[PDB]
Amino acid sequence: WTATSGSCKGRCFELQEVGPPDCRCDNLCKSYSSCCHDFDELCLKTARGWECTKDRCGEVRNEENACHCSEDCLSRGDCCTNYQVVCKGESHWVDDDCEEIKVPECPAGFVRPPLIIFSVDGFRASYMKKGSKVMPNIEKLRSCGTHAPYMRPVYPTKTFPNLYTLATGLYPESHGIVGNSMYDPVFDASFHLRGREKFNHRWWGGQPLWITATKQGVRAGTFFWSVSIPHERRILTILQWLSLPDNERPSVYAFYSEQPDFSGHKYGPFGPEMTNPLREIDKTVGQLMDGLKQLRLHRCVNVIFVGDHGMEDVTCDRTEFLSNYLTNVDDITLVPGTLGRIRAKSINNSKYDPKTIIAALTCKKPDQHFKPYMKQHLPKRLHYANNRRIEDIHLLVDRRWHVARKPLDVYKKCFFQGDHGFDNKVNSMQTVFVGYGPTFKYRTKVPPFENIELYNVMCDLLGLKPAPNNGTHGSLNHLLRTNTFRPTMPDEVSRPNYPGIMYLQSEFDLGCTCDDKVENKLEELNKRLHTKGSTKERHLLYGRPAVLYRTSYDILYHTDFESGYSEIFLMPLWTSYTISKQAEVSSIPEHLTNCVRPDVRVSPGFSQNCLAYKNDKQMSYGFLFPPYLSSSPEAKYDAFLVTNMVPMYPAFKRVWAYFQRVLVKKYASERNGVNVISGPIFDYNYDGLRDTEDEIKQYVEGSSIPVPTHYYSIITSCLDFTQPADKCDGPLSVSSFILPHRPDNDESCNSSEDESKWVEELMKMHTARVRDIEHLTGLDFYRKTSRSYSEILTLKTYLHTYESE
């Protein structure tokens, strides 16, 4: 119960929010329907519209008007945004040439440039080009300020997960808003776009920019807006707050637009009906900018123009129905749409088998427009697993399609032509970024980046120290004219051992055999140089990775590859090698088919053993440096060391062997050499972070040899491909992957064909950023290059998406 009989006189859009049962006057009261009885009258004035006309100039102030054209309005801070244009012969902001803003040009009393976030729902990246003729304000911001060709949203590419990622720097799995709708099994409650449950703070984790600001003494306007407040009133409210006294005035402001998303859903991303909502958004930008120029804040404010996701063509007839796949479709609950999440209908029911559900959904129809996954098998790049609100069963739906439970859910619940929510690498889902102001660069294009990175930059723009988040601080330093953050390399925690030859062959009892006993002082010093690091400048091009946690490990040098060998996990953490464009692929000679050799540098007690693999009827093994790429028949023996061996399912060896034998050579060929770092990843609790030894749930039968959940490779070359990878003078070019280490290839519907028809497709799906691999391994890559650290941080956040342009 609210006693809404209090008044909003003098409290319109109050910044601090008042505790019930006292009525409210802030920009959210309408959503709680707890506004004071006079809120509409006092606070939502509309009389005479939004613009001055000749006949209003100098008028006697009428307090009933939406905004004012009277003389005193500039000092009151409540002129219509075109006042100066109509009544003082000034020009619209868009009509002014852009002049570089070398320094903040702020009125007296401004302790720092204000930040205004202008966020636009459903603003697909390609609107910047395709709608350019009808968005002159936005086009000016874009070409004058700093801009990216597109910004990658987070998955799912839905509104609430994305806006709250913008505000926190956190993956949805970490901030809690893992969908537009979601069910929490602990709360036994559902969050939806519509309704009151979303107002409860228990859903919203992390620390959003406004709490970060407030905790450090910077004042923040509200980021949420009630839908009923029109856009003209939001702009005028922001401009009013900007006229407040220094000690009361916010330093950060957010404006939110429901468009073009609202129309996009109705008309598709490029419906003829889409031109007007784009005109209208642009007009609002103009209003804000004229509003700023009026207050002489237009060369003082940093403005971020940002979308939460794009929009794709989706219609009712492109819907897959689960009722066509399962007979027991009434036992499940589906979160439907552009992604699927499936859980048991009647919770705590032991008849429900996720495994049998997945199998009924796998590769059942030749043209199937979704693929089921256990959440922990989703591509690690989606970071979509580690939250109890994410159902164990996930469906990644194809672009342009929907999934629904039964036909009655679609014809009893065609409305729409547009939707979003698909995989965040999908072109139609990319969105926009423009930064404009004193702190952003002038007429600068930056590469596409992920929206998780902005929280750190916004904190910098406000002089705040950011809460711990998923951005990589420093990786967007190149957006900024002046940087408050100077990134530095994390310190190495464990230093390696460099063992020499310490063990005699006969000390090893590993059940390993090799055909290696075939009989010169010239090639004898030469082999020994290799074991001591003579070829290391060739295979470790960017210095050795740093180990960022406490462990025990050895550097092992070889003619063709160097490795970091863990005595704890009994395998390499990383193996590094370079394959020039000239290098040749050979076979494993028949006499060496099952060859595994003890490593005399590494004690029996810290080695794997062949007996374990023999006994484990599921588990086979593979090699991190591929024997296929040995530089000489003599060097090939090194590839068969027990210290280069890793546990691999036969199903997975098909993928790995094709990567090693065919793809590495092809990339070296296409990229003019490549350097490869490969290794195991252990993430049994699917939190995206390196597991400690006591977290491993699977070992090779009868052994202490832990089974990796994934295998990664980082493939680096010279961005200028006329230079070879091993002699590169400038910026680097990278692509990486994290492949799930799975006992079957059920993920790849084509896996019964030749590897050349499915393997590369799979690896593409599991493309990753170097930074993802760093969190999963506790390693730090690229410690010794000639490049600046902030450039390396950008490189480590790069994701090769394989989309077309």
Ligand X SMILES: *[C@@H]1O[C@H](CO)[C@@H](O[C@@H]2O[C@H](CO)[C@@H](O[C@@H]3O[C@H](CO[C@H]4O[C@H](CO)[C@@H](O)[C@H](O[C@H]5O[C@H](CO)[C@@H](O)[C@H](O)[C@@H]5O[C@H]5O[C@H](CO)[C@@H](O)[C@H](O)[C@@H]5O)[C@@H]4O)[C@@H](O)[C@H](O[C@H]4O[C@H](CO)[C@@H](O)[C@H](O)[C@@H]4O[C@H]4O[C@H](CO)[C@@H](O)[C@H](O)[C@@H]4O)[C@@H]3O)[C@H](O)[C@H]2NC(C)=O)[C@H](O)[C@H]1NC(C)=O
Ligand Y SMILES: CC(=O)N1CCN(c2ccc3[nH]c(=O)n(CC(=O)NCc4ccc(Cl)c(Cl)c4)c(=O)c3c2)CC1
With DSSP H G I counted as helix, E B as strand and the rest as coil, what are the percentages for the chain, rounded to 5?
30, 20, 50
Q: Work out what residue 205 binds among Ca ion, Zn ion, ligand X, none; the CB cut-off runs from 5 to 8 Å by kind.
A: ligand X
57 versus 611: smaller Cβ distance to Na ion? 611
Q: Dig out the tokens for 27 from the structure.
A: 């920009």
Q: Is 265 annotated as a binding residue?
A: yes
Q: Dig out the tokens for 2 from the structure.
A: 């609210």
Residues 252, 220: contact at Cβ < 8 Å?
yes
Name which of 475, 469, 391, 472 is nearest 165 in CA terms: 469
DSSP 633-696: TTGGGGGGBGGGEEEE-HHHHHHHHHIIIIIHHHHHHHHTSEEEEEEEE--TT-SSSPPPGGG-
Q: Work out what residue 751 binds among Cl ion, Na ion, Ca ion, none; the CB cut-off runs from 5 to 8 Å by kind.
A: Na ion
Q: Which amino acid is at 648?
A: M
- Residue 711 bridge partners (DSSP): 680, 739
Query: What number of helices (H) and strands (E) belong to the chain?
Result: 22, 29
Residue recorded with tokens 């020009």:
91
User: Is residue 225 a contact residue for ligand Y (CB under 6 A)?
Assistant: yes
161 versus 778: smaller Cβ distance to Zn ion? 161
How far is it, in rounded angstroms, from Cα 596 to Cα 593?
A: 9
> Residue 771 is inside which H or E element, if any?
helix 770-777
Interacting residue with Na ion among 475, 630, 713, 751 (CB under 5 A): 751
Q: Is 746 annotated as a binding residue?
A: no
Least distance (Å) from Cl ion to the CB of residue 201? 20
Q: Work out what residue 794 binds among Zn ion, ligand X, Cl ion, none; the CB cut-off runs from 5 to 8 Å by kind.
A: none
Catalytic residue among 81, 157, 159, 797: 159
Least distance (Å) from ligand Y to the CB of residue 223? 4
User: Is residue 173 a contact residue for Zn ion (CB under 5 A)?
Assistant: no
Task: Please list every residue from 235 through 274 that binds Na ion, using CB under 5 A.
Answer: none
Q: How many residues does the chain have?
A: 805
Q: Is 685 annotated as a binding residue?
A: yes
Question: Contact residues for Ca ion (CB under 5 A)?
Answer: 121, 159, 261, 308, 683, 685, 687, 689, 691
How far is it, in rounded angstroms, from Cα 570 to Cα 644?
A: 10
Q: Work out what residue 691 binds among Zn ion, Ca ion, ligand Y, none; the CB cut-off runs from 5 to 8 Å by kind.
A: Ca ion
User: Is residue 784 a contact residue for ligand Y (CB under 6 A)?
Assistant: no
180 versus 257: smaller Cβ distance to Cl ion? 180
Q: Work out what residue 174 binds among Cl ion, ligand X, ligand Y, none; the CB cut-off runs from 5 to 8 Å by kind.
A: ligand X
661 versus 796: smaller Cβ distance to ligand X? 796
Least distance (Å) from Ca ion to the CB of residue 401? 19
10 versus 366: smaller Cβ distance to Na ion? 366
Residues 378, 371: contact at Cβ < 8 Å?
no
Torsion 499-505-507-511 (CA) sign? positive
180 versus 630: smaller Cβ distance to Cl ion? 180
Q: Is 691 annotated as a binding residue?
A: yes
Q: Is 420 annotated as a binding residue?
A: yes
Least distance (Å) from Cl ion to the CB of residue 269? 19
Question: Contact residues for Cl ion (CB under 5 A)?
Answer: 179-180
Is 472 an active-site residue?
Answer: no
Name which of 219, 184, 221 is nearest 200 in CA terms: 184
| Nearest residue to the partner Ca ion, using Cβ | 159
Interacting residue with Na ion among 733, 745, 790, 801 (CB under 5 A): 745
How far is it, in rounded angstroms, from Cα 138 to Cα 289?
A: 10
Q: Dig out the tokens for 491 from the structure.
A: 């310190």
**Binding marks (x or -) toward Na ion, 605..624, rule CB under 5 A?**
--------x--x---x----
Least distance (Å) from ligand X to the CB of residue 439? 25
DSSP 389-414: TS-SEEEEEPTT-EEESSTHHHH---
∠ CA(741), CA(743), CA(746), 5° rounding? 100
Q: Work out what residue 179 binds among Cl ion, Zn ion, Ca ion, none; the CB cut-off runs from 5 to 8 Å by kind.
A: Cl ion
Least distance (Å) from ligand X to the CB of residue 302? 25
Q: Work out what residue 261 binds among Na ion, Cl ion, Zn ion, none; the CB cut-off runs from 5 to 8 Å by kind.
A: Zn ion
Q: Is 689 annotated as a binding residue?
A: yes
How far is it, in rounded angstroms, from Cα 577 to Cα 557?
A: 11
Q: Work out what residue 180 binds among Cl ion, Zn ion, Ca ion, none; the CB cut-off runs from 5 to 8 Å by kind.
A: Cl ion
DSSP 339-363: EEEEEESSSS-TT--HHHHHHHHSS
How far is it, in rounded angstroms, from Cα 286 to Cα 304?
A: 14
Q: Which stretch binds ligand Y (CB under 6 A): 161-169, 259-267, 280-288, 317-325?
A: 161-169
258 versus 701: smaller Cβ distance to Zn ion? 258
How far is it, in rounded angstroms, from Cα 301 to Cα 277?
A: 25
Q: Is 616 annotated as a binding residue?
A: no
Query: Euclidean distance between the first and final Cα of the chain, in Å?
Result: 55
∠ CA(479), CA(484), CA(486), 5° rounding? 90
Residues annotated within a binding site for 1-tetradecanoyl-sn-glycerol 3-phosphate = 159, 180, 261, 420
Interface residues with Na ion (CB under 5 A)? 613, 616, 620, 745, 748, 751
Interface residues with ligand Y (CB under 6 A)? 28, 31, 160, 163-164, 167, 198-199, 201, 204, 223-227, 256
Residues annotated within a binding site = 121, 159, 180, 261, 265, 308-309, 420, 683, 685, 687, 689, 691
Q: List the catalytic residues.
A: 159
